[PDB]
Amino acid sequence: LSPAVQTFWKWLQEEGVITAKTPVKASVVTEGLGLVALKDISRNDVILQVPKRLWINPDAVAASEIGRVCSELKPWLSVILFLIRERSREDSVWKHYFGILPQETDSTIYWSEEELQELQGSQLLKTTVSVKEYVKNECLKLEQEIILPNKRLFPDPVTLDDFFWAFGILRSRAFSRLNLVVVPMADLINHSAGVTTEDHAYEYLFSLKSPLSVKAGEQVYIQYDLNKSNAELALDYGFIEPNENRHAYTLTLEISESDPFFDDKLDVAESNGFAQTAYFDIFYNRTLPPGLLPYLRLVALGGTDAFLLESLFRDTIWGHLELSVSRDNEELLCKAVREACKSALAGYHTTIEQDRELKEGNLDSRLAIAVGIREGEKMVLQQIDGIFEQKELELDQLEYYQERRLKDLGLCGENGDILENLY
Numbered sequence: 001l002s003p004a005v006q007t008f009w010k011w012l013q014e015e016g017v018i019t020a021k022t023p024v025k026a027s028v029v030t031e032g033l034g035l036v037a038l039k040d041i042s043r044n045d046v047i048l049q050v051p052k053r054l055w056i057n058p059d060a061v062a063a064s065e066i067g068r069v070c071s072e073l074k075p076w077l078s079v080i081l082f083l084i085r086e087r088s089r090e091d092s093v094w095k096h097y098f099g100i101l102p103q104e105t106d107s108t109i110y111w112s113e114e115e116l117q118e119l120q121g122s123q124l125l126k127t128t129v130s131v132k133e134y135v136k137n138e139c140l141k142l143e144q145e146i147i148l149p150n151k152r153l154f155p156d157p158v159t160l161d162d163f164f165w166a167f168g169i170l171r172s173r174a175f176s177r178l179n180l181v182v183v184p185m186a187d188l189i190n191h192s193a194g195v196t197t198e199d200h201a202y203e204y205l206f207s208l209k210s211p212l213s214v215k216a217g218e219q220v221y222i223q224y225d226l227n228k229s230n231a232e233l234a235l236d237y238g239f240i241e242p243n244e245n246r247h248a249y250t251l252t253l254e255i256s257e258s259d260p261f262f263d264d265k266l267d268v269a270e271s272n273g274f275a276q277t278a279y280f281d282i283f284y285n286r287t288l289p290p291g292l293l294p295y296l297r298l299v300a301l302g303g304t305d306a307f308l309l310e311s312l313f314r315d316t317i318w319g320h321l322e323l324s325v326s327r328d329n330e331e332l333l334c335k336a337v338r339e340a341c342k343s344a345l346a347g348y349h350t351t352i353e354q355d356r357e358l359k360e361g362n363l364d365s366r367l368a369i370a371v372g373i374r375e376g377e378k379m380v381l382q383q384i385d386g387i388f389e390q391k392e393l394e395l396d397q398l399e400y401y402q403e404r405r406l407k408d409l410g411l412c413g414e415n416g417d418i419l420e421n422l423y
């Protein structure tokens with residue numbers, strides 16, 4: 001199979017990890033390296049169980065030679081260093097493990113500038129840049145505060161490449177729900193859309209249980225996360241899914257401070273669970289998130305309907321926001337959204353037709369990722385615009401505040417005056 005791999009498999013054996021009740025070996029699969037069943041495996045059938053003696057989480061770093069210096073560092077920053085450090089030590093307990101780790105993944109955090117150009121105008125590009133920058137600073141401050149000082153624990157220099165290396169390793173390998181633990185064995189099982197149960201973590205050791213009945217020769221998979229968008233999967237790991245329901249685009253709304261009614265609006269927003277700035281994730285084919293419309297109406301409020309910000313309504317204001325304020329309010333927010341969508345759609349360099357034709361051929365993993373992501377984002381953008389386009393049509397089918405107030409007027413009651421004269 002592989003010198004470095006075969007050597008890694010020997011290591012797990014000389015540790016009690018892989019005994020005989022381990023129905024799985026490693027192999028070269030389209031998705032890198034994976035676990036292939038040596039014998040049939042049934043649902044929830046235990047596959048592997050590595051002893052905590054072999055983790056690489058905050059607790060393991062706090063108990064190593066650098067456990068003192070990283071005493072007050074954020075959990076991930078601590079593991080980043082630990083990982084870089086052990087990677088150099090020829091006497092490390094993971095000497096064989098590291099000889100297996102991929103230097104890179106297809107995460108956007110490794111893409112070249114040309115590769116990144118394929119994501120031009122995409123929300124994913126923005127998210128990736130932000131994250132790259134952040135990690136950079138946080139990592140450079142580490143060099144000057146923990147690496148350079150203790151030139152005794154860190155003999156060799158430390159480049160950004162090494163930093164992003166460890167960050168990537170952490171974000172595409174560690175297990176969240178249990179907090180940022182890593183397991184040299186379980187670190188090999190890949191993701192499949194076949195899995196829809198999501199729940200394979202258990203435990204001192206790490207107990208991994210196959211959520212599916214794999215036949216001998218086949219690969220053992222798991223579901224990384226059902227709720228992530230394709231943009232999220234693209235950054236965290238280096239892949240995405242064809243499933244159009246994974247496409248999402250998040251909108252960001254806010255109550256500007258330049259708004260003449262800022263103070264009252266912020267009061268209304270916070271009193272109902274929303275901050276000065278709010279993020280609404282919009283997934284394809286899914287209905288608009290609750291709160292998006294009422295928050296949009298609050299943003300668009302305006303002088304005419306400002307009377308709703310009075311103490312008198314502080315208890316029902318949100319209810320009115322959910323039902324609708326007025327035709328001018330509604331019409332304003334619709335144009336705002338629709339223009340934002342058109343404006344955004346115009347930032348991409350390919351049409352959806354071109355993306356779809358490209359997908360009909362063979363594409364390098366990174367290009368395939370950019371094409372699927374940008375196509376998806378365009379679908380969401382166009383769906384959002386269509387939703388509000390209808391809205392602009394049905395602009396008069398909504399019963400606004402005024403009309404709702406006169407519904408119960410009782411114009412046609414009784415001839416009250418007959419009783420008014422009886423006393």
Ligand SMILES: Nc1ncnc2c1ncn2[C@@H]1O[C@H](C[C@@H](N)CC[C@H](N)C(=O)O)[C@@H](O)[C@H]1O
Pocket residue numbers: 030031032033034101102104105106172173187188189190191192237238239
């Ligand atoms: N469904 C998938 N399609 C493509 N790559 C995948 C998939 N699931 C996992 N991976 C890869 O596996 C890596 C993350 C780890 N969970 C697994 C290690 C990987 N099998 C290796 O050979 O190192 C990521 O870098 C992904 O590139």
Ligand SMILES: CNCCCC[C@H](N)C(=O)O
Pocket residue numbers: 172173174175176177186187188189223224225
């Ligand atoms: C070997 N990589 C593990 C993937 C972890 C996926 C997700 N964070 C979880 O906790 O299930």
